[PDB]
C-alpha cells in the first residue's frame, strides 16, 4: 500500500502531494499531514499530502520537482511513510546553482526566498533541490543545513539565508544524471538473473540466516567490451536502495604500491558502514591479474591481500562484492576459488530487439528525422556492440554535420542558431555510418525440379515434428532421424539434404567420406567424433554424409590391411549414432552412389531407418529441372524446353545442368562476338538461340550406363520383397 | 559398447599401427586380471561379431 | 601536463611516440611501467570533455 506509482502533477507544487481518498483511510493519512518520500538511490523528500479526485489509487500525483528530488521518474515505484515530529526551523542555509544564477545579481532572498515561503509552512530537507519562480529566470536552490536536521518545518520565525559559495555546478549534474536500470536494454533475463543473485541477500540477511546458507560473498562479469558491465551493475544498484561504491582498477594501479592496499581497505570499510552496499570493482583482472604470471610481487601482494579481506567480509552486515572483467581468464583462480566470486556470469552481445531499444535510448537525447527508421538499422547491424552502436550513431551525427557544412559556415566564429536547431540526423547519415562501421542451405525447393513424393516424404519427416511437437507427445513417439538417399550420380541428392536443412532453418554440415579416413591409427575416428561433436554444437542441425559406401563397408568382408581400420570405423560411427539417439534435433542423412556394400548395422532403425530411392528422373522432372536451370537465363521463347527434355530420356541432371550451362555460355560469346563486331564496323544477341543448343548437345554424352540403373532397381526390388506382407488386416 | 573393435584374435596384420592394436589387447588383459586385487569393477561388453574377439578375452 | 590542459580551455594534448611511454602492460616487464600506462588510462577517463580538451597520440 505504502508503494505508489508516479504520476504527473495536475495543481501540486514543490511541497505538496496527492493521494487517492480510499488509499489515504488504508494509510490512516489525513489531509495537511506531512509524510517521508524514499527514492532511488537513498534520496529523501518531505512534503504536505494532499487529497484529489481525480488521482488514481495505486498511482501519487507529484510534480518535476520532486521527481528530480527523489530521482524518479514516471511510472517509478516511491514508498510513502507517515513523518511525525517535524519541528519547526531555526535556521535554514541555501545555496543556489551556479547555471540558475549566472547573471543574477539581486538579492536572492527577497525575490525568491521570502514569496516562495511566506506562510507555508512547507517541510524541507537536507539536500532537496526546490525550483521558485521569480525575477527574471527560474532559480534552484539546495538546502545545505537545517535545524532541527534532517526534517524541520519552515515557520514564519524560521531564519533563511542564503550567503555562502554557490554550490558547484558539476556536483548537482552528476546525481541528475544517473537513473535507474532503464537506461540498459536487451539484458532483463541477465539483470534479473543479477537482481536475484545481488539484492535480495543485501536487503534479507536473515531469509539467508535461518536456513543456514550463506549469501554470496562475491558475483563476476564478463563479456566483450562495451557490453555495458559496469553500466548495468550500476543500473541494477541504482533500482535498489542499496549503497553503491565504485572501484577503478586503473585508479588503483595508478597509486603506488602500499597506497592501493590503503584505499581498498578504506573503500571496503566504508562499505561496511553504508549497509546495504555495494562494491563494484571495474576491471578486477587490471588490479588481480593471474598470479603465475607476474614478473613483480607488488601485483601478487595486491591478490593476496583481496584474499584475505574477501574472506573477511561478514556477511552479517548483508554487504556483497561485484567486479566486471573483459577476460575471467585472465583473473587469479584464487579470486575465484568456491567462496570467493563463486556466482559467475556472462554478458553476451546484446540481441535485435535490445539493439533496437540500445538505438532508441542513445538516440533520445538525439533530434531525429522522421524518416529514418531505427528497426532497419537494428537488423542491418546483427553482431555490433552496445558501444559500436554508441559509436555508431556519432558517426551518424558527424556526416549529418558534414552534410551541414555548406549552410553553415565554418569560417564564422558563431553558428547560426536556426541552423543548428533545423539540423537532424536522417537515414541517410545512418546508412553512411553503417557503411563506415564495422562489428542454413542456400538452396530452396523451388530449384529441385520434381520428386514430389521424395518432397513431401522429406517434409514428413523432418519439418513436421518440430511443426506440432504436441501432437507427436500425444502420441508419445519420437521422431525418426535417419535417411539414406541411394541412386545414381548426379540427381540432386546433395540438393534434396540442402533443400530439406533450408526449409527447417537449421545448420548444415556436409562431411565426404574418403576426407575422414586419414592414414594414422587413431585419427579416423577420432575425426568421426569430432564431426558428431560438431553437429552437437550446431544442434538443431542436419549432417550429411556423402559416399556413405567408402565410409560404411561390410566389417566381415575384409581381408587387406585397412580392412581393421575401416571396421573400427563402421563402430565409431555405429556408436555414435547410438549417442545422436538421445537429441532429437540432430538429424542424419546419408547418401550413397551404391548401397549393396553398406553394413546392414547403419540399415538397423534407429540409425538409417527411411531408406528413400532417387531415381532418374522422368519427363515432367527433367522440363522442371531445365526450367529451373534456365530462371537465371534469359531463354528466347523460340527454345521449347520439351523437346530438349523428352530426347534425352536417359540423361541424369547433371548432364542438363551442364548443357544450361554451356548454352548459356554461348549465349555470352555470341554476344561478345556482336559486340566486338559492332565497335568494330563503327569504327544484337538479347537471349540464347536454338543453334548454340543443338550445337552445344553434341558434346554432351551420357553419364549414367544401363547395368547403374538395373543395381539400382534390383536393390530396390530386393528391399520391396522385404517389405512383403501384401495388406495386413486384424482377425474379425 | 563394440567390443569387437579394441579386442581382436592378435596377429591379423602388420599394418595396425605397426602392433598398436596388438599392444592395446595386452593392456586390456592385464587390466581386467594380472597381479592386483580385484575391486568391485564390474565389465560389460556388447559385442555385434563375438568369432573374432580375442579368446583371451572371453 | 592534464591540470595545465584542463585550467586553460579549449586545450590540446599531443604526446608523441606514445608507444614509448604506454606499450601491452603484458609485455612490460617493470612496474613504474604499468603504473604509468595505469595513469594514462586513468586521465583519459578523468577527463569528461566539459573543457572539451582533445588528445592526439602519434
Ligand atoms: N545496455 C546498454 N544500453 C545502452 N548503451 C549501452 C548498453 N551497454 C553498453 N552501452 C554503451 O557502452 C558504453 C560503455 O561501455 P561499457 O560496456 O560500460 O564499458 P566496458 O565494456 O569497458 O565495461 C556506453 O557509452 C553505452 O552507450
Ligand atoms: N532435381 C534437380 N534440379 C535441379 N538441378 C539438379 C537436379 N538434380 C541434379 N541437378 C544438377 O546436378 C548437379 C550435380 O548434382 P549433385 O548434387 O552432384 O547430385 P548427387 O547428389 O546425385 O551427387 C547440380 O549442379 C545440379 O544443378
Known sequence: PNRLIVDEAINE???????????????????????????????????????????????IRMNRVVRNNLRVRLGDVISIQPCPDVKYGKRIHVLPIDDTVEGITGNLFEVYLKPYFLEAYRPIRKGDIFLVRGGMRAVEFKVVETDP????????????????????????????????????GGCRKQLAQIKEMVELPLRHPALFKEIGVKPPRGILLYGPPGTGK???????????????????????????????????????????????????????DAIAPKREKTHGEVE?????????????????????????????????????????????????????????EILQIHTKNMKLADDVDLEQVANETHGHVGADLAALCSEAALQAIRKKMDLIDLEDET?????????????????????????????????????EDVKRELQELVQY??????????????????????????????????????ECQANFISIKGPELLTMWFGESEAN???????????????????????????????????????????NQILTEMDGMST???????????????????????????????????????????????????????????????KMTNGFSGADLTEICQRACKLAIRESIESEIRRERERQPVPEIRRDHFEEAMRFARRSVSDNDIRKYEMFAQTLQQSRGFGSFRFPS
Open 230 to 284: 559496469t553500466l548495468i551493475a550500476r543500473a541494477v544498484a541504482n533500482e535498489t536502495g542499496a549503497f553503491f561504491f565504485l572501484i577503478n582498477g586503473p585508479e588503483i594501479m595508478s597509486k603506488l604500491a602500499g597506497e592501493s592496499e590503503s584505499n581498498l581497505r578504506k573503500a571496503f570499510e566504508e562499505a561496511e558502514k553504508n549497509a546495504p552496499a555495494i562494491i563494484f570493482i571495474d576491471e578486477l
Open 465 to 502: 515434428p518440430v511443426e506440432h511437437p504436441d501432437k507427436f507427445l500425444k502420441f508419445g513417439m519420437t521422431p525418426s532421424k535417419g535417411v539414406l538417399f541411394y541412386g545414381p550420380p548426379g540427381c540432386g541428392k546433395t540438393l534434396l539434404a540442402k533443400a530439406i536443412a533450408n
Open 300 to 356: 601478487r601482494r595486491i591478490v593476496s591481500q583481496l584474499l584475505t579481506l574477501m574472506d573477511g567480509l561478514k556477511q552479517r552486515a548483508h554487504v556483497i562484492v561485484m567486479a566486471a572483467t573483459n577476460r575471467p581468464n585472465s583473473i587469479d583462480p584464487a579470486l575465484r576459488r568456491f567462496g570467493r566470486f563463486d556466482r559467475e556470469v556472462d554478458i553476451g552481445i546484446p540481441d535485435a530487439t535490445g539493439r533496437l
Open 13 to 59: 507544487d514543490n511541497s505538496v502531494v496527492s493521494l487517492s481518498q480510499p488509499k489515504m483511510d488504508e494509510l490512516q493519512l489525513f489531509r495537511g499531514d506531512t509524510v517521508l518520500l524514499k527514492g532511488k538511490k537513498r534520496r529523501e523528500a518531505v512534503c504536505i499530502v494532499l487529497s484529489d479526485d481525480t488521482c488514481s489509487d495505486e498511482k
Open 149 to 184: 536536521s534532517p526534517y524541520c518545518i519552515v515557520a514564519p520565525d524560521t531564519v533563511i539565508h542564503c550567503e555562502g559559495e554557490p554550490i558547484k555546478r558539476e556536483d548537482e549534474e552528476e546525481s541528475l544524471n544517473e537513473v535507474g536500470y532503464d537506461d540498459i
Open 583 to 645: 537429441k532429437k534435433n540432430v538429424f542424419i542423412i546419408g547418401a550413397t552412389n551404391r548401397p549393396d556394400i553398406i553394413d546392414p548395422a547403419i540399415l538397423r532403425p534407429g540409425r538409417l531407418d527411411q531408406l528413400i530411392y532417387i531415381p532418374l528422373p522422368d519427363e515432367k522432372s527433367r522440363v522442371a529441372i531445365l526450367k529451373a536451370n534456365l530462371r537465371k537465363s534469359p531463354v528466347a521463347k523460340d527454345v521449347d524446353l520439351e523437346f530438349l527434355a
Open 528 to 570: 568421426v567424433r569430432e564431426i558428431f561433436d560438431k553437429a552437437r554444437q550446431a544442434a538443431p542441425c542436419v549432417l550429411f554424409f556423402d559416399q556413405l559406401d567408402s565410409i560404411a563397408k561390410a566389417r566381415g568382408g575384409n581381408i587387406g590391411d585397412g580392412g581393421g581400420a575401416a571396421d573400427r570405423v563402421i
Open 415 to 451: 553558428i547560426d542558431a536556426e541552423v543548428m536547431n533545423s539540423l537532424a540526423v536522417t537515414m541517410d547519415d545512418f546508412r553512411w555510418a553503417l557503411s563506415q562501421s564495422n562489428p542454413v542451405p542456400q538452396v530452396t525447393w523451388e530449384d529441385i525440379g520434381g520428386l
